């Protein structure tokens, strides 16, 4: 009984320059180009392994982290299953003795290591790059990238490794709308992330929430005339491995976007307490420090990401765990240490009585990491009888 | 003969937001704001000013009992100026007229704001500067040639020199003869509107809309979309449509805090109990089925939430349901069937969170008061000293 199954992870991916409002709502075409920093595997992943087999019971079945999800035709992850699917059977229809995998059921199993981390981006990244390992697809990152923008458009992003553009593209059917390295990981491995994870617990009750922005910000019109300025910027800033500017553009690009958000009707409100602190002490790392070492970014949600080079992690990690005693130990992956403040910090920027612990949850010290990598027979996450080995 | 004057003047709260100059030396704005003045029977500044021709050389002023220095061609030594030349001009055109422009001034002022609740007071102080001195010296000038003077002294104060709903001109002129306060209804107009002050707990205005003007570029669309607001919210005050004043007031807060956000650095003043705030009120009116409340913003984390009268019992069941308030600071309704109690954290806030709510309303321009409000004893010290 000759099994096929192929089982691959990708990585997370965190937008220096932000992906937010989309033209298609279908296709997932955004209405302004995005730049992201791939992150290390070894530290966050989502794995998913493909089975395809003659013999199982008709129907495509995927588990999340243990529990069923429902392929509902139309939705994003059959869409993903049936652009890869179709790509399989071309190979098929150009060499008639292959067999035809394209036309048994799919068993599909995923999980991820994590918080409120964003996980759809690494999660479509990963279902493409299993079933094109399982379908041996001889389409390149680019290509694919296309299908897992339409998963999710983040997604499209973690089909490199290092930092990477999703371009937006003019064609209404999408074919340019498609994912870029800008620059390999190779290019700067020195840079290194800390995700500080913040506790959310005073708030009530993203794709929804983009298109009220598309909707109702005015403010939203000047941000996508910006947005093409600091796309180029950082790109030179990349390619120049200029620290202070790369860092100027993504603080400036995190705001921009959470502007707008406020500037929606009703307004969107991510950043917490927690994070304007983060910010005030990283805005005074750099001040204390006469040059810009650090620079944070906030997706949707409350959890800081802050990008500095390894050297100056060691003042990172310092200020943070000054102000932010967590919840959760911590470990650098690296053995990477604390610094003190640097002289003339102004700890006054931090409110009178600090932070209890736990405010932040816990530190994830992180890198540039590689592009989706294809795993071994060991690393399943399926059964001999294709129904995944953990079950929730 | 004591020559002496006290006015008081009314805080007033912007539905359209002044955020950026530019001119720093005159306070020319970016663009135009409008305002609501608030009643006076709340809250207000109040200033006595005495000129005797027997005091010791030189002005003196105090604030809140405590003496404050008046350094030539700073801001209230230019307003004084600008406001004694406007009086000796009356004396040169009658010989017969006291010399009062010639006499060292004694000025007291004090305002009744709360304590702690963070409201800010340089506005209404100064209108109300510009008021009793005007009335010391019996100025003819209108209350829009006096907003001139208010505004170069400190903003937003021209907006108190008017009762109800006020605008500031940015005007076009290099040397701001036209960037000056102007009705655009008055209190008669619509005495309904009312505002509940919702003071936050909280863990600087001229130096921080600066490094927006320099560093926002959503600015320069706000910019762009401010005229459209001023005229439709003008609109909407004279058609008395409080669901289009609602939206248009809610709008531009957040508009303003957008572009505070945007800032580099970045510039927070809502907090987490503000955000919490925006989302009762949102929901109060999605549950009540029509607009009732507006929230907005100004430099710091409280909420000013307008309403009509007959609808404050709604605003003020709403807050105090989720937001229990402090000791050291009325009829409520239940909230509208159907309001959605997750837009909250469970259980609502701790006690305090909100400090405290001031229920008040659009109110009248500046008062001349009576002898016996005046803030300073015989000898032209005031009465109470810190
Ligand atoms: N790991 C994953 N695989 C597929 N879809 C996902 N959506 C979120 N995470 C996912
Ligand atoms: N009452 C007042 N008088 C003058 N200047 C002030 N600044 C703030 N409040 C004031």
Known sequence: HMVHEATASAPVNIACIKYWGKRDTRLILPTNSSLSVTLDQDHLRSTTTSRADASFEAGDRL??????????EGGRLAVCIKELRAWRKEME???????KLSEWPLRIASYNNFAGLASSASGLAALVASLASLYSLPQSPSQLSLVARQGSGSACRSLFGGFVAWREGTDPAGSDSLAEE???????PEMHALICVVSDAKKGTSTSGMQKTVETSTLLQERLRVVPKRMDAISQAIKA???????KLTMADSNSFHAVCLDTAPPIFYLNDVSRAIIAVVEELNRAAGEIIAAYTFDAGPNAVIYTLEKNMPFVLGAIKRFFPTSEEFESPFQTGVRDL???????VVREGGWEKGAVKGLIHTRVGDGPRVLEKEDSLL??????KVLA
């Open 182 to 188: 800008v620059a390999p990981r190779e290019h700067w």
């Open 63 to 72: 588990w999340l982290n243990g529990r069923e999800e429902a392929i509902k």
């Open 241 to 247: 491995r200029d620290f202070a500017e790369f860092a």
């Open 342 to 348: 640097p002289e003339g910090f102004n700890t006054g």
């Open 383 to 388: 059964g001999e009888n294709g129904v995944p």
């Open 93 to 99: 229809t150009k060499d008639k003795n292959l067999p």
